[PDB]
Design a protein around this ligand. Sequence first.
Ligand SMILES: Cc1ccc(O)cc1
Ligand SMILES: Cc1ccc(O)cc1
Ligand SMILES: Cc1ccc(O)cc1
Ligand SMILES: Cc1ccc(O)cc1
Ligand SMILES: [Fe+3]
Ligand SMILES: [Fe+3]
Ligand SMILES: [Fe+3]
Ligand SMILES: [Fe+3]
Lengths: 102, 102, 83, 83, 491, 491, 305, 305
Amino acid sequence: STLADQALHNNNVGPIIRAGDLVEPVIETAEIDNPGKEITVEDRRAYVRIAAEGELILTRKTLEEQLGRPFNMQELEINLASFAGQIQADEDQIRFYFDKTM
Amino acid sequence: STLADQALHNNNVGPIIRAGDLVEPVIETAEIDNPGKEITVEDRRAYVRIAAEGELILTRKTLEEQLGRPFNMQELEINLASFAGQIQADEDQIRFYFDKTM
Amino acid sequence: SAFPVHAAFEKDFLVQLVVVDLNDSMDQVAEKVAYHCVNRRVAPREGVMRVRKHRSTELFPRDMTIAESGLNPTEVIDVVFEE
Amino acid sequence: SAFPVHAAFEKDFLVQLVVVDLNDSMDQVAEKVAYHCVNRRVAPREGVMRVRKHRSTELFPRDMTIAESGLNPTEVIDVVFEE
Amino acid sequence: AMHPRKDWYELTRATNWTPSYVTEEQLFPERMSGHMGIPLEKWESYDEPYKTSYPEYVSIQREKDAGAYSVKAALERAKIYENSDPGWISTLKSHYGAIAVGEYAAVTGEGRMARFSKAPGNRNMATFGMMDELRHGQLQLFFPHEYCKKDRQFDWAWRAYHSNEWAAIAAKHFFDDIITGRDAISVAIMLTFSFETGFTNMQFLGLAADAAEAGDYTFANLISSIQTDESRHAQQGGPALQLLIENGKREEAQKKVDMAIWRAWRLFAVLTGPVMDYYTPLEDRSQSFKEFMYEWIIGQFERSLIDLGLDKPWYWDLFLKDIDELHHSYHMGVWYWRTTAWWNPAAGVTPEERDWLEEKYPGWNKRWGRCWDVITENVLNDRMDLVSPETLPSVCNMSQIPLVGVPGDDWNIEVFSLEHNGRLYHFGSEVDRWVFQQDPVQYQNHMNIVDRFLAGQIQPMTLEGALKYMGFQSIEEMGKDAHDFAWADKC
Amino acid sequence: AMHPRKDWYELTRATNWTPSYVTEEQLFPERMSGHMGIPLEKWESYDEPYKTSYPEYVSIQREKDAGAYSVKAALERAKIYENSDPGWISTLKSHYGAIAVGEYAAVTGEGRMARFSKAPGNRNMATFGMMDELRHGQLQLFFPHEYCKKDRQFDWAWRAYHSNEWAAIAAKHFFDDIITGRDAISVAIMLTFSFETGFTNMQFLGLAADAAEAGDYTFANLISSIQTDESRHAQQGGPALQLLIENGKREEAQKKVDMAIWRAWRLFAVLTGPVMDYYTPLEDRSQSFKEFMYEWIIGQFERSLIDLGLDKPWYWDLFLKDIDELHHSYHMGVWYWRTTAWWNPAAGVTPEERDWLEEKYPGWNKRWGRCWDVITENVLNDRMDLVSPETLPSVCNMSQIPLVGVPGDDWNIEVFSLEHNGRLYHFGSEVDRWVFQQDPVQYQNHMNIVDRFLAGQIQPMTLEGALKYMGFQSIEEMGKDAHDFAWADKC
Amino acid sequence: SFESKKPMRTWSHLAEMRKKPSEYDIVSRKLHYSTNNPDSPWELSPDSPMNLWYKQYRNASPLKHDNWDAFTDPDQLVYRTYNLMQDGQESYVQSLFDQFNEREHDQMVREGWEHTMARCYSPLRYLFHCLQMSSAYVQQMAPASTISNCCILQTADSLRWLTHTAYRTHELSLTYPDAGLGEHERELWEKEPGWQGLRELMEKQLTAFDWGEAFVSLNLVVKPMIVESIFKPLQQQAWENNDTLLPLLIDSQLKDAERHSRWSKALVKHALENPDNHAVIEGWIEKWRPLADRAAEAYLSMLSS
Amino acid sequence: SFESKKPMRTWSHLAEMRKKPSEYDIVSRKLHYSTNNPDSPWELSPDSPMNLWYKQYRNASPLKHDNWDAFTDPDQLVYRTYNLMQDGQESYVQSLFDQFNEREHDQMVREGWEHTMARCYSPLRYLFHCLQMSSAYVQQMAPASTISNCCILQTADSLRWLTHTAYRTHELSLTYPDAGLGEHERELWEKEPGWQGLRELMEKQLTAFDWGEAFVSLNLVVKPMIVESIFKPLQQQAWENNDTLLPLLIDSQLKDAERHSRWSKALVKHALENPDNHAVIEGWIEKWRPLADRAAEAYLSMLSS
Ligand SMILES: Cc1ccc(O)cc1
Ligand SMILES: Cc1ccc(O)cc1
Ligand SMILES: Cc1ccc(O)cc1
Ligand SMILES: Cc1ccc(O)cc1
Ligand SMILES: [Fe+3]
Ligand SMILES: [Fe+3]
Ligand SMILES: [Fe+3]
Ligand SMILES: [Fe+3]
């Protein structure tokens, strides 16, 4: 249960992006829009688990620049297969976050 | 040149359908809409060459029934990668045909 | 006289329905259960097979019958080897 | 004194640019062409290499030079073996 | 110009009013609404975190489907059916059979909320939820339909829920308990929170990873697209839970979550466990079942549950032990009784696979390996009668899955029994018994397949009789070893 | 209600009028229009058989692209680049380099017709044609762009037409002759009829078949989608030809078709021939190059040409002989001089492959096999200097491709030379010389790469100097044996 | 003994069709397994609360047919084609909103029209949400998946109308901030006489739990009344007040409304294969018509004031 | 000696950008290889007829810039996004056509309006086709692919407008079969005084072969004149004659028109980086304005009659 305890006591938040054209742009966006946070990426081929500690923001403006084509925030739903953390989303950005620190 | 002569002296007309959801329905449609004509099919995996002697008709009504969903004739363009014969097309059907008999 | 029980055989992975007879001795019960386990998922071994109510410590006497045992139909038993 | 010709070597698959010398004998021309063909795409063989204008029937004399041949720069020659 | 959603969104959910011509309780009856006496006014605090609006929905869902169907069309000739490992094909058969018509049933759970939830935002998000589950049911009938002409087992994508096949009964007993059989708030907690944020990621994304490794992009692309919808409508449960907690109903909320998670666990252990650790070819196992559980259920889901203010379930330690053990026994059972499945279980115990299992589950060879040794010996000696059953397994009165334990060197098996209203029930865990005791009226007169067999409802009382009762319409439909025992050539 | 296209279509092409403020010849100058003196009124008979209208076009093309991009996205992780045979990767590099920016050039051919054709229906269909070629150019830059980060040779999808690399010059000399360098009617006949109904099927559908066998569905799906557009806009040529014939211009029409078909043939023989018979892995060769030629060029295209009332080309028998022979020599050349290509040619002469070649081309081993024997021996003996050239090949003044013949047991090679305006030109066939003689002002002062080398335009005059002139910006970009001679391990 | 059978070209339940099964047949037909066992709709205790609910309100409905599953949506819509259709209609409406806003349409309406909109239009969000709730109830109770599917799409359409109304209420309030737009609709729905007939109608309709009565009251009584007495009169009023957007918007909503009427009428036709059903349906229509008529009269009196 | 280089993240010509290349950059930039060799635009004899044409009408244009390729469409449209945008706008227009036809819009226009449409609207198909031809010419001659791409899309938009006009001409003729709709437009274009200024303008513009003069006359003179003097006055006339469809249609066409003006103005800005270009552009505008003004006056006089 050491293993289980350690797995539970994480503060990882962020998007799980399904395989497709949003994977690389979302990783790059996570890096740019969260300076001074380490972004972790786990590649499972069909999806990529992208995370930061405590909070991870993706802005529409940055994602549009990294994707290279016009992009509305709601379109992320086409490729947002899951996420860790609670979510707060509007037309300008999405925030993945935890209220508690474990 | 026997081989070449024989290849040239054909009267085969009909659609070449690219791999996708239109292959089976077009074959079935060719059979139904041209009773008393033998329909030949050559499967090249990326496309299928479908032919009859002299004339081959595909009607929108039949293709819609064989496809199983609403269908306008012009949509065949999404999957009509090439064709043998001259073409006459309108909203109700497409006709592949030759003027000459070789 | 058919008497359904649910039986767990020692070293097997599951509990199975085994229909025994009201008048079967525990020795016979054990054999009827063993039929569905030994040489299927459980290696044969030396020793005397015993029957006990599931998770119980007390073993039924070898000669005791299902009728004499007080067991009710569809109750769970274990079949185990003497320690 | 550089003299470019286009040469087709017997049993090879193409014509190549070979720069020879105005004063080269046909024997030397043949060797300069052979360099780019024999043991590359053409098996070596016994026999005397000869030079002729492309598709011509007449062979140039072995000792004749490019200057004496009347060939113009960038004209096509064949290098072949005596029949 | 167009005005941003944030400026008008509140009006779309400004739809609660004070009833005058019927009573509030008549309009929202507790048995259907599950509001726990919390008055209408309190429900207006409900705030769905993953919003959409109708014009955005139809536009985006149009795009999602165009992608799913385009990929399917483009890959029809990729020879998946012909060239795939048979274990992978069985994984498809299992999935579509277990899932397609259950998705369609989830429309009803969403509908229950759309009509009976007192929270206006919930009623609207449930409307998109109804639409999403309609999409999922239709996709997961359309996709396998082309394989009907290849294999009668694919008929079960449609047939399974219409049958009394043991696994279909386990699926229906679960879904009818958490989706279609309870009030709107129970649905919000048990379906949208517990099942849909908790477990479905295992089957729709964990399995997608294996599908991608196996080179089945039609399937990986399909189920990962489906999960993008799940990720939105599953967000109805959290705000409900938070509202219940704020209104003095934490204990009630916690019990519902605990029940739903355990019920989901037992079902996923029998469906997803064997797929991930045995059916999927070894080379395509992105992670083990346990590793995926620790990623999705412990690392993600349980951490989210704590963040929202709930507690780890009372049965935490039992659950962890189960993750190490249960699916190995479930797999063994499904395979030994393969003839009752509509898919072809792969044994998955070649020496190379047994080494992997030992690495992922230290001690495996001294436990399940002991039984697989006996089975393997019988196969190598052509004693095929000893690899097919001549009796029924005993079945849990809650999960509808057979009662199992740990075999081999440290044998341990426990059945948890209960006398109730003149009847003897048997459960495969302390938690399953506890679930029954939480709400006996939901379960008490249900008869499991073994109960029916003993009561004379299955005639004749034989293997063949049971197979007919389970809805098998021809011999080809019954499950066989995925590789026709060709794996023995590796032993 | 909406009115059917047939009821209003005529008004969309009722756009000819009689000029009053400038002359008809000023508005449609012969050098740009190519109307051959046929008056405006006669052109109104032009009737495009494959119609579309603007609203249908944007709707359908939206759907076509959604499919192409969705498939690409879904298969990014299919390991094509990593797991494909290197011969297949070279096929991609060759294709995108030879095609992408040429598609964009075809926009100009379509534009020439949209402005300068006297036929109103032609001007409208040419407008959709401009749009189609824009699509094709953009698709075929977008698709390879992701591989830039993997391999500098993919840069040539963009760079090739900006270079003086020998194959890029061959491509540009052809496309500038039939697409961008002639009047609108010549474009209609040479591009839309001859090239686009005749030959492109080889590269966009024949190759798609091999791609599907090779398991590259992103590519097969892409190029087959592209060809659906080709099938529509290519239909501008037939009605032009029929109109020319009706108006006493059969001889002129026939000559243009004959010229274009031959020019296209020589280019496809060097591009598609080696791909189909050598680069594509043996297991993925759906048919041989010759078999595809007999399907697409003889069985389909030539039969259509006869149906429209034209004659078989004068050079028919020469063409048939060429199909048996030319591409084998072109392949040998491209491979021996591989360092000048931007792709990595695969030799394709393992014993298994040589057996296939012998079956598909009886006598192959006694011809090309003789040279491959010498090469193979050198490779097996590590005499690598003998497998790289130390001089330039002689180059055709029309096709810009080296001058070849049949090697081995029945050696035969012929160069067709011509003195013209104080200069000596060399052609690789009777037909190529004939093409030059049809229109010397188009060609007479063009210098091929060997002409430039001899005239001092390429400095220094060495292999390295030529490679720099051809635009190679680093050593990794120059072509090598696809398998690093690993094929020798099969010999 | 079992028999050996070969693969079928389609699902076993469709294998007997003469025609090749359509997309609609494949993904829509015979999906409610809850109708298989009359004693236990759901796979639980036969007397579990939801089993008792279904046995009473679905299985025991006086509206009876031995094969509800054979029902066919006349439009044969599936999720995929619904979204194609509605993305089309909704893109059109959104384009109208954009263009009319650019042209400052709302500033040009007749004096006082904003007050009529505030009183007679904006509170429609309540009515449309009632239709949405009610449609969802028919969905969950209907005895065939092909029937429920029509109800799902109708629930979605009701939310579409609700959302139109919300958007326009907000938008109008930007030009007319002192008319109570977006502020007073609950008060009007609750207290304004012109809304009380509709509110009484819907509160009562929402408590008709028999699936058949729910369907008849909703789709054969309430919804046709809304077309005749709300939608079309609003268009007429809009015309008289130089509101040129509302009539185009309502025309789009009416396309949905006619579609709901088409499938409903098709269900009635199916039901009438059983002669007993005419009196049942007619009885329910006669029961609800007075409430529907009073609702319409009160609304129209308000719109006329 | 050669140097060893590693893979680039993008095309070699974009590798020096700071920003990650967009879809637009990847597929649009620096595609005209015909500008690489000033002596031989095309890979043929340097004095081949088309080489002489390009050397005269492109390379020798007095409109000069050392880096035309750096031009950027302000909208950064590619084929893919153009079709998304236009399928949206065109679906909207087609929906308007459908709905207004259902409502019998054409029967309700003011007495005699059909005659105004026949004379002043239907012959626009000729003018729009001239714009289409002219746009195609600028496409083929422009010295950068990013410029040509804007012209391709503008050629397509011109055909879109032509097609609108054809459809409506036919549709109007169904209600008014005795007004010459669909029959007399060529005669009007050729002979009616109100059309002669426009026809003279376009025939002359179509024979301006210098790429720069073609661009300036088309996009800076003719097209803005059409917006001011044809499109907007037709909307006003339509309003006065109870034609409510035409103004909505023209509003959609005006979106395309403003887009053409946006890229044109962006090209002018790019060109003006070279000070010499102001006098060249200004000179061409002054040259063509009188023809454009006379065209407008004649048309307006006709529309007013
Ligand atoms: C991705 C996303 C964007 C907006 C939103 O409201 C929800 C989700
Ligand atoms: C496929 C098709 C249909 C109509 C038409 O006009 C052309 C082609
Ligand atoms: C069976 C099912 C139901 C709902 C869901 O989201 C997933 C699977
Ligand atoms: C290079 C090219 C041009 C046009 C075309 O249709 C295909 C290929
Ligand atoms: Fe779902
Ligand atoms: Fe769900
Ligand atoms: Fe093309
Ligand atoms: Fe083309």
